[PDB]
Write a protein that binds this DNA or RNA. Structure first.
Ligand SMILES: [K+]
Ligand SMILES: [K+]
Ligand SMILES: [K+]
Ligand SMILES: [K+]
Ligand SMILES: [K+]
Ligand SMILES: [K+]
Ligand SMILES: [K+]
Ligand SMILES: [K+]
Ligand SMILES: [K+]
Ligand SMILES: [K+]
Ligand SMILES: [K+]
Ligand SMILES: [K+]
Ligand SMILES: [K+]
Ligand SMILES: [Mg+2]
Ligand SMILES: [Mg+2]
Ligand SMILES: [Mg+2]
Ligand SMILES: [Mg+2]
Ligand SMILES: [Mg+2]
Ligand SMILES: [Mg+2]
Ligand SMILES: [Mg+2]
Ligand SMILES: [Mg+2]
Ligand SMILES: [Mg+2]
Ligand SMILES: [Mg+2]
Ligand SMILES: [Mg+2]
Ligand SMILES: [Mg+2]
Ligand SMILES: [Mg+2]
Ligand SMILES: [Mg+2]
Ligand SMILES: [Mg+2]
Ligand SMILES: [Mg+2]
Ligand SMILES: [Mg+2]
Ligand SMILES: [Mg+2]
Ligand SMILES: [Mg+2]
Ligand SMILES: [Mg+2]
Ligand SMILES: [Mg+2]
Ligand SMILES: [Mg+2]
Ligand SMILES: [Mg+2]
Ligand SMILES: [Mg+2]
Ligand SMILES: [Mg+2]
Ligand SMILES: [Mg+2]
Ligand SMILES: [Mg+2]
Ligand SMILES: [Mg+2]
Ligand SMILES: [Mg+2]
Ligand SMILES: [Mg+2]
Ligand SMILES: [Mg+2]
Ligand SMILES: [Mg+2]
Ligand SMILES: [Mg+2]
Ligand SMILES: [Mg+2]
Ligand SMILES: [Mg+2]
Ligand SMILES: [Mg+2]
Ligand SMILES: [Mg+2]
Ligand SMILES: [Mg+2]
Ligand SMILES: [Mg+2]
Ligand SMILES: [Mg+2]
Ligand SMILES: [Mg+2]
Ligand SMILES: [Mg+2]
Ligand SMILES: [Mg+2]
Ligand SMILES: [Mg+2]
Ligand SMILES: [Mg+2]
Lengths: 140, 148, 20, 97, 166, 191, 80, 95, 107
RNA sequence: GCUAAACCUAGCCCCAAACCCACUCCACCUUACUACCAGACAACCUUAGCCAAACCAUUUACCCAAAUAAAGUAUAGGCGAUAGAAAUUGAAACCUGGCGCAAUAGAUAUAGUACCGCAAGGGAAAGAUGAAAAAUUAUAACCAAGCAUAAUAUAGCAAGGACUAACCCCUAUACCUUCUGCAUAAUGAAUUAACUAGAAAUAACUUUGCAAGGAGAGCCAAAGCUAAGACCCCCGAAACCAGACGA
RNA sequence: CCGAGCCUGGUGAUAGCUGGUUGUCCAAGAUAGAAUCUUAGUUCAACUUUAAAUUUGCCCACAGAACCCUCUAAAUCCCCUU
RNA sequence: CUGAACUCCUCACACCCAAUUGGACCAAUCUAUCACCCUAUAGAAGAACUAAUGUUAGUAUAAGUAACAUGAAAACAUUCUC
RNA sequence: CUCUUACUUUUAACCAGUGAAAUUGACCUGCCCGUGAAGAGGCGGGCAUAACACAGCAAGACGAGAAGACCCUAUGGAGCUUU
């Protein structure tokens, strides 16, 4: 009994369908396409890490820009918002800067206020009571 | 198959070859463990336990003389004349519980096996069969079909 | 170094003789 | 290229032809027939393969032994050469020793 | 081999409605197995694309290439065929809608080299395809002007969204 | 499979016509090195690992296993209401339509295996009817086998056949291990 | 020529998809396509919308004057 | 080793093994010590006694010797008055 | 990959769920062979599951068609005009139940 | 839109059976195919070597008249590699079939022709409508590479993430083989189609049967025995020897 | 292509040497040595894998392991508990 | 403050080591029986190719590149030049 | 040769006809320094940079061609010599 592959055409089309938008002969020549298609799929897999990384870099750049408009550096805003128990993440903070500029100025003002309270406390010797915005809500 | 060498290509040395070191199976001195093995007489053991068990199940009849034919026809012993078997040796295993009275013809019998049969009123005889005779007595029907 | 020569091999004629 | 552009002619199989209908009959010729005939005697084919099985080297040796004297000169030469090649392969070449 | 170009002159369209615009006549003609290169023939076919039938014939009559005479011969029989069999009123009212060359069936021959070596020589053949459409030749495209560039640039600026956010 | 003999065969590189000479020198030509034009790499060359027939597939299940299989097939037919016992296979007529109509009326399925005790003593009427049919097949008791029983949806046995099959199949359960082939004379066999 | 039917059948299916894509068929009413029961479709329409429609009124709402005038013309053409 | 003989297509026994080793039915192989007949004048009595011993082979050697012999040599034999009859069967062997 | 395929923005059909939720699945067409082995799981789904599934979804018209077929299929049609064909070849009854429920929940 | 693509027959393979063997007239061992002249010459005679023994030097299976079994036993042997009986035992046997190939397959075969060689010798390729061609203005189209329709716009393994947006932004040192380690300026590869490479004993394991027995004479057996399943590739030297052909 | 012609056959010469070795998916997985005309390879150990059996394995408290001689070394071995 | 495939978070989980080894599936083909717009359960086997300076065929690249060819006029008769 | 120059023919380039070969993983085929299987068009840091022909040139593509002939290895060959 002599067996021969009868559906090789379909096996080839499984790869070439992913190579139609490629440049040059590697969009139609299996030998060439198969290598480039594999590389494309590997890139797609690893890009999921970069997508997350690049998104956060973008948010920090955008938050940095918005903070500077109010005379605040990025680390001062983020650090002091945490000390106020405001857990807004960078994605939302970047969205607020673009579409809710009045709320963002309020957040910038709050961070600036908390930052100044920190300085007053550090300069004092413990005589002063805790700042109004420095008080932490305790949970149990 | 691995990578290169003789083994990937299927050219590794014969079994027993050790790479050039004088092989284990050659460096041992010759000794006559098996010298003359094919000319040694062999006897299939038949214990008194087996003999009694065959009698109790009706596979061997003690009312008639028992010999190699009756034992073979009862599937008590399997004799191989072509493997230098010369018959059955009666072995003493089971003597304490042997109760049957039998007239039995064997090729070899131990002293204690003879005592067991004789204590119970039976007769035991030691009989010699040559290789050809053993083949015929063990399987009579195939012989009769030869016309000799 | 021993003289090394490789002679040319002609292909079968018919392969260049087919007509319409 | 490489794939036919039309469907092949439909496959018509008569499952109840006499050959298929009676397949297997007398396979228990011995068990049900007092063992006068062995089922292997129902096998039809080359005289050196009836009721016997072996690897290609064994088949070659068996055929040369049973019908080698009746083989054609060219066929017998090929058979002798095949036996030599297979002898070398199985006895000297392989992964296991 | 494929011969679809000759079957395009056999398509009968259904009668037009009273208010529909008059459909231009389309005439497909070709010459098969020309002893000439398709690569060289491409240049002549390229030259006359979009030209009127008369302008194409004039350009080809004074070309020095061998293909020019062959194409001119094909164009003239296509023009005659358009009026005779395709109900084209004015023979001059035709323009080259399509003109291209194709590869023909070629022959292989041996070319001898020195030292007993050889090469395989191909005796090249080609096809020429032409489509004639009734009507004046379509006008050429005006060069994109500065106003168009500025309009396109500003359009791209106006389609620009805030990316990766709400 | 036990009686299968495959007749497929191909030629090795040693058996393909020609191929003696080395097609071109080992070195200097710039081409791949080759020893013979009939190598399996070449068009028209030998087959590397093709069929080497004729090839036999003979083997034998233990006699007891083949006997047990017959028992299982009969039980399955009875348990699934596909077994019908007849007193005899005598039909009123030799017309095949009668037998076909009888099976339809009795809801006997598309195909029926008819088993008689002996070939010689089969009634002439049933012989005439079955000879003209394709799904109604008449066999002697010695011809009964698992494949036929599974291929046919209904099994019909005569009462003498039933007694015949019980004797043969139950003999396998109570017998000694053989001393020589059962074809040779024994004390109590045959019967 | 290679043995087998499956690969050829699969290729026929693809040749028919490409043929259809090259010449997309003219669209037709869903009612004209298979698996259509008008009464069942009318009832599901109301249920999807969570509305207790009266099936007599709902059916009339879909009937248009153009469909009635044309339905009558077909009747006259067939002499019914 | 000859895996398939040219005349019979059957595996052959290496007769060098038969000449040197005794196989017990339990699977053990018994050999003599190399050099037990060599230069006894320079060997001590303790060493000479060790050389006279009949000793067993290890698992790896036993597996090799099994492969180098056919099944005939592994059958149970009943030689009359066999010196090694007792050693054929193991006793009180846990795993 | 993303560059090798089309994309769209997250959206709904006629602002679904804003004023009221409307199930988008509108029709289901089963094709189950009477005798095919591949359709065994589809036949068992039609005997006990399809009737109870229709009671829960009165806005979906289910068309069961028994005919000779080597590959049983379910065809889902939605109010927006989308048509989806999903094979149920050799699928178990539980597998088919899961698939059919997924089609009901999609837009 | 071209070039092309697609096909099912020609025949062939392995068995069975059967013993086998031709012829018109004329010409043909001289320079064969040459009507017609003085001769006388006559056939027989151990294969070798590759290869294995990891060199090699004795040695290294080759149908020789019944399947099986005895038995890989007796025996032979640098007692190494390996070689290897017999006595004895004793079965079946109905040609006209195929889980064989289907134009790169299957015979080399359309043919030992064309072609190549002084000679011995080597040795191809390919065909495809239909009931009718005394229907040839006929049988659709759709599919490899290659091109055409339709050249090109900063930047870089040619893609991925994306994006309103092709590109511009960001990330990213082809593949196989071979190596301590290869983007490597180490190997192979123009590309398409087709073809092209893992063969089995010894035991062991797994799943049935029966069980001190198993097995359809042989064999094994101190739970064994029978059956089955499942593991061992492809291409390549320079050589060696025998017999022919060549000044 | 004469350090000894050519063709055919033995012949599928042999090659510890180079090259090649075809569907998907998961899992465990790195390395003391000895001998060898042997070091471009093999066989045995060692390591690694699968199945099976039943019982300790690893980590380690005291106590304990040499004189001769210079660095009176970092440590090791043994080892209950855990 | 930034900063990983570390860790947490929502959901899921057999799903990142060469040689080698164990396991779960599987394209097409043939056969048995089903099935009947292309399948099922089994049995088989010439059973799967991005690589061997692989074999054969087609077509590219180099490239319309290297290279190749016909002394002159005329009435095609003839004459002239060499 | 100092030290080359001029002219003729061929080749050459352009037009027309005919039409090969080795070579080719894919190429969207820059320069500098640095790095790295240790000498980079492809990596890092810089610099440069609309697109596309034709004619030259031979510094690089460890350029093409020939599975290095030198050297070593193989229990691979062969010729020749010999106490
Ligand atoms: K072997
Ligand atoms: K011995
Ligand atoms: K040698
Ligand atoms: K051929
Ligand atoms: K390098
Ligand atoms: K390198
Ligand atoms: K190199
Ligand atoms: K490579
Ligand atoms: K002469
Ligand atoms: K290499
Ligand atoms: K080596
Ligand atoms: K001058
Ligand atoms: K250069
Ligand atoms: Mg992070
Ligand atoms: Mg390799
Ligand atoms: Mg190695
Ligand atoms: Mg010449
Ligand atoms: Mg040959
Ligand atoms: Mg030769
Ligand atoms: Mg060779
Ligand atoms: Mg062939
Ligand atoms: Mg040797
Ligand atoms: Mg004999
Ligand atoms: Mg052929
Ligand atoms: Mg194409
Ligand atoms: Mg970049
Ligand atoms: Mg190196
Ligand atoms: Mg690297
Ligand atoms: Mg490279
Ligand atoms: Mg190299
Ligand atoms: Mg195997
Ligand atoms: Mg020699
Ligand atoms: Mg040699
Ligand atoms: Mg000679
Ligand atoms: Mg002369
Ligand atoms: Mg010569
Ligand atoms: Mg080889
Ligand atoms: Mg792992
Ligand atoms: Mg030595
Ligand atoms: Mg080593
Ligand atoms: Mg401890
Ligand atoms: Mg983790
Ligand atoms: Mg996980
Ligand atoms: Mg499938
Ligand atoms: Mg294959
Ligand atoms: Mg391929
Ligand atoms: Mg290749
Ligand atoms: Mg050039
Ligand atoms: Mg030139
Ligand atoms: Mg000239
Ligand atoms: Mg030039
Ligand atoms: Mg030119
Ligand atoms: Mg190259
Ligand atoms: Mg550098
Ligand atoms: Mg480079
Ligand atoms: Mg070079
Ligand atoms: Mg080299
Ligand atoms: Mg040598």
């Amino acid at each position: 009994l002599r067996n021969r592959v009868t559906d090789r055409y379909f096996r080839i089309q499984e790869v070439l369908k992913h190579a139609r938008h490629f440049r040059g002969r590697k969009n139609r020549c299996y030998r060439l396409a198969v290598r480039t298609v594999i590389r494309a799929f590997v890139k797609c897999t690893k890009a999921r890490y970069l997508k997350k990384k690049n998104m956060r870099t973008l948010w920090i750049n955008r938050i940095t820009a918005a903070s500077q408009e109010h005379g605040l550096k990025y680390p001062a805003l983020i650090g002091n918002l945490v000390k106020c128990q405001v857990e807004l993440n960078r994605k939302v903070l970047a969205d607020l800067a673009i579409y809710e500029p009045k709320t963002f100025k309020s957040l910038a003002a709050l961070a600036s206020r908390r930052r100044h309270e920190g300085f007053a406390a550090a300069l004092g010797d413990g005589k002063e009571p805790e700042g109004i915005f420095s008080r932490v809500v305790q949970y149990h | 198959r691995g990578h290169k060498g003789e083994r990937q290509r299927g050219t590794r040395p014969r079994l027993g070859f050790e790479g050039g070191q004088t092989p284990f199976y050659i460096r041992i001195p010759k000794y006559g463990f098996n010298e003359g093995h094919s000319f040694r007489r062999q006897y299939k053991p038949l214990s008194l336990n087996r003999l009694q068990y065959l009698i109790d199940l009706g596979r061997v009849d003690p009312s008639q003389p028992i010999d190699l034919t009756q034992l073979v026809n009862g599937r008590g012993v399997t004799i191989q004349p072509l493997k230098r078997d010369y018959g059955v040796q009666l072995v003493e295993e089971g003597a304490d519980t042997f109760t049957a009275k039998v007239n039995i013809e064997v090729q070899l019998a131990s002293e204690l096996a003879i005592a067991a049969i004789e204590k119970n009123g039976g007769v035991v005889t030691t009989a010699f069969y040559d290789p050809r005779s053993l083949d015929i007595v063990c399987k009579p029907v195939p012989f009769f079909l030869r016309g000799q | 170094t021993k003289k090394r020569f490789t002679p040319p091999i002609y292909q079968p004629k018919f392969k260049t003789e087919k007509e319409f | 290229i490489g794939i036919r552009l039309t469907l092949p002619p439909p496959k018509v199989v008569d499952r109840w032809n006499e050959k298929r209908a009676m397949f297997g009959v007398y396979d228990n010729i011995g068990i049900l027939g007092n063992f006068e005939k062995h089922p292997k005697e129902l096998i039809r084919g080359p005289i050196w393969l009836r009721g016997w099985k072996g690897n290609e080297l064994q088949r070659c040796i068996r055929k040369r032994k049973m019908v080698g004297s009746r083989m054609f000169a060219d066929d017998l030469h090929n058979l002798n050469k095949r036996i030599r090649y297979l002898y070398k392969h199985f006895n000297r070449h392989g992964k296991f020793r | 081999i494929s011969r679809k170009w000759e079957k395009k002159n056999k398509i009968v369209y259904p009668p037009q409605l009273p208010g529909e615009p008059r459909r231009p006549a389309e005439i497909y003609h070709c010459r098969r197995q020309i002893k000439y290169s398709k690569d060289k023939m491409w240049y002549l076919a390229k030259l006359i694309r979009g030209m009127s039938i008369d302008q194409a014939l004039a350009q080809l009559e004074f070309n020095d290439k061998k293909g020019a005479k062959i194409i001119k011969e094909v164009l003239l029989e296509a023009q005659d065929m358009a009026v005779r069999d395709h109900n084209v009123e004015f023979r001059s009212n035709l323009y080259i809608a399509e003109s291209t060359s194709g590869r023909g069936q070629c022959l292989k021959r041996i070319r001898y080299h020195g030292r007993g070596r050889f090469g395989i020589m191909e005796k090249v053949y080609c096809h020429y395809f032409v489509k004639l459409v009734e009507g004046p030749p379509p006008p050429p495209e005006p060069p994109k002007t500065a106003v168009a560039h500025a309009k396109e640039y500003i359009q791209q600026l106006r389609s620009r969204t805030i990316v990766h956010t709400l | 499979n036990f009686k299968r003999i495959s007749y497929a065969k191909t030629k090795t590189r040693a058996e393909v016509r020609g191929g003696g000479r080395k097609p071109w020198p080992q070195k200097g030509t710039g081409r791949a090195r080759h020893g013979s034009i009939r190598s399996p790499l070449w068009r028209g060359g030998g087959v590397a690992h093709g069929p080497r027939g004729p090839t036999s597939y003979y083997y034998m299940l233990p006699m007891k296993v083949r006997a047990l299989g017959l028992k299982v097939a009969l039980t399955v037919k009875l348990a699934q209401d596909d077994l019908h016992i007849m007193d005899s296979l005598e039909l009123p007529t030799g017309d095949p339509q009668y037998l076909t109509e009888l099976a339809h009326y009795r809801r006997w399925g598309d195909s029926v295996l008819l088993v008689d005790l002996t070939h010689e003593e089969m009634p002439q009427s049933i012989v005439e009817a079955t000879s003209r049919l394709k799904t109604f097949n008449l066999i002697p008791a010695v011809g009964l086998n698992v494949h036929s029983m599974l291929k046919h949806q209904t099994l019909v046995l005569t009462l003498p056949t039933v007694a015949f099959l019980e004797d043969k199949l139950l003999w396998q359960d109570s017998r000694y291990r053989p001393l020589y082939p059962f074809s040779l004379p024994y004390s109590d066999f045959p019967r | 020529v290679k043995k087998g039917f499956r690969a050829a059948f699969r290729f026929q299916k693809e040749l028919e998809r490409q043929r259809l894509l090259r010449c997309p068929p003219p669209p037709v009413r869903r009612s004209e396509k298979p698996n259509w029961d008008y009464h069942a479709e009318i009832q599901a329409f109301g249920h999807r919308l969570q509305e207790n429609f009266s099936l007599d009124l709902l059916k009339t709402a879909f009937v248009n004057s153009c469909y009635i005038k044309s339905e009558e013309a077909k009747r006259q053409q067939l002499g019914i | 080793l000859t895996y398939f003989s040219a005349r019979k297509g059957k595996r052959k026994t290496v007769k060098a093994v038969i000449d040197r080793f005794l196989r017990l039915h339990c699977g053990l192989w018994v050999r003599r010590k190399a050099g037990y007949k060599k230069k006894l004048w320079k060997k001590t009595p303790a060493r000479k006694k060790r050389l006279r011993e009949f000793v067993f082979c290890n698992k790896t050697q036993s597996k090799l010797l099994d492969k180098m012999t056919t099944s005939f040599w592994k059958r149970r034999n009943w030689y009359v008055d066999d010196p090694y009859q007792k050693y054929h069967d193991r006793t009180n062997l846990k795993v | 990959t993303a560059r090798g395929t089309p994309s769209r923005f997250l959206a709904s059909v006629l602002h679904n769920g804003l004023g009221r939720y409307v199930q988008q699945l509108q029709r289901l067409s089963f094709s189950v062979s009477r005798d095919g082995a591949s359709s065994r799981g589809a036949r068992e789904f039609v005997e006990r599951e399809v009737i109870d599934f229709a009671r829960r979804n009165p806005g979906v018209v289910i068309y069961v068609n028994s005919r000779p077929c080597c590959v049983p299929r379910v065809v889902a049609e939605y109010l927006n005009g989308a048509v989806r064909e999903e094979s149920i070849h050799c699928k178990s009854v539980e597998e088919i139940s899961t698939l059919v429920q997924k089609l009901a929940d999609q837009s």
